[PDB]
Amino acid sequence: GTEFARSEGASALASVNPLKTTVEEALSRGWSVKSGTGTEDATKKEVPLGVAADANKLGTIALKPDPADGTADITLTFTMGGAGPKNKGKIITLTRTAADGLWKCTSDQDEQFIPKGCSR
């Protein structure tokens, strides 16, 4: 009844949306992106995303493939394991298609709580 269901979705998307820039900046250097926190690794030429998996207590952030070099589709997911009953277990997926470099957002939330710019 009183779950903050719209704000949960907005918060989840706000945790992953800024990582699009992080990914693009690494790929433009010809470096790979890897999950988690840490320093750039000049031996393997990997840049970490810079955010902990649990930075937002609504859920968990994941990257696939890990590491990612831009020659395959990339997905960033926010899995809402920490949310209330309407959104628990739902997943927001950002996909960067390697063929064209374009990003899409899909969600399996109930349509009324899907954030702006994302589709089913």
Side-chain angles (χ1 to χ4, degrees), residues 26-43 45-63 65-82:
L27 298 182
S28 286
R29 296 164 60 195
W31 289 42
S32 293
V33 72
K34 67 178 171 170
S35 68
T37 62
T39 53
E40 287 192 3
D41 182 346
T43 302
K45 302 209 162 38
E46 296 174 353
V47 177
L49 285 177
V51 62
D54 68 335
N56 185 331
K57 302 302 175 175
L58 287 173
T60 165
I61 298 164
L63 170 74
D66 183 10
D69 66 11
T71 68
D73 293 350
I74 290 170
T75 161
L76 290 165
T77 54
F78 197 96
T79 299
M80 299 166 87

Side-chain angles (χ1 to χ4, degrees), residues 5 7-10 13 80 87 90-92 105-110 112-120:
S7 320
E8 285 173 328
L13 179 60
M80 299 166 87
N87 282 317
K90 302 301 190 167
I91 301 173
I92 292 171
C105 179
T106 57
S107 173
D108 62 8
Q109 296 167 281
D110 293 333
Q112 89 178 300
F113 309 123
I114 289 175
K116 178 187 161 174
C118 302
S119 70
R120 233 180 127 65

Side-chain angles (χ1 to χ4, degrees), residues 38 59 68 88 115:
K88 181 154 172 205

Side-chain angles (χ1 to χ4, degrees), residues 73-76 93-97 102-103 105-106:
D73 293 350
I74 290 170
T75 161
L76 290 165
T93 300
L94 308 192
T95 303
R96 184 194 188 270
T97 30
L102 294 184
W103 287 89
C105 179
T106 57

